[PDB]
Amino acid sequence: TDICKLPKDEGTCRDFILKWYYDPNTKSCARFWYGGCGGNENKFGSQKECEKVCA
Hints:
Belongs to the type VI collagen family. By secondary structure, the protein is an alpha+beta fold. Helices cover 15% and strands 25% of the residues.
């Protein structure tokens, strides 16, 4: 899904939560801090879910 190729988007706001995004260059998911606003769909709550959908 093109969703998995969207770039990492930390967004804005200050309700910081650790999320996971898929990195097509390493073909694996990595952690990132999301502020709570203005992100995109390449964002998952767990490494396992991110891997299932995008790996």
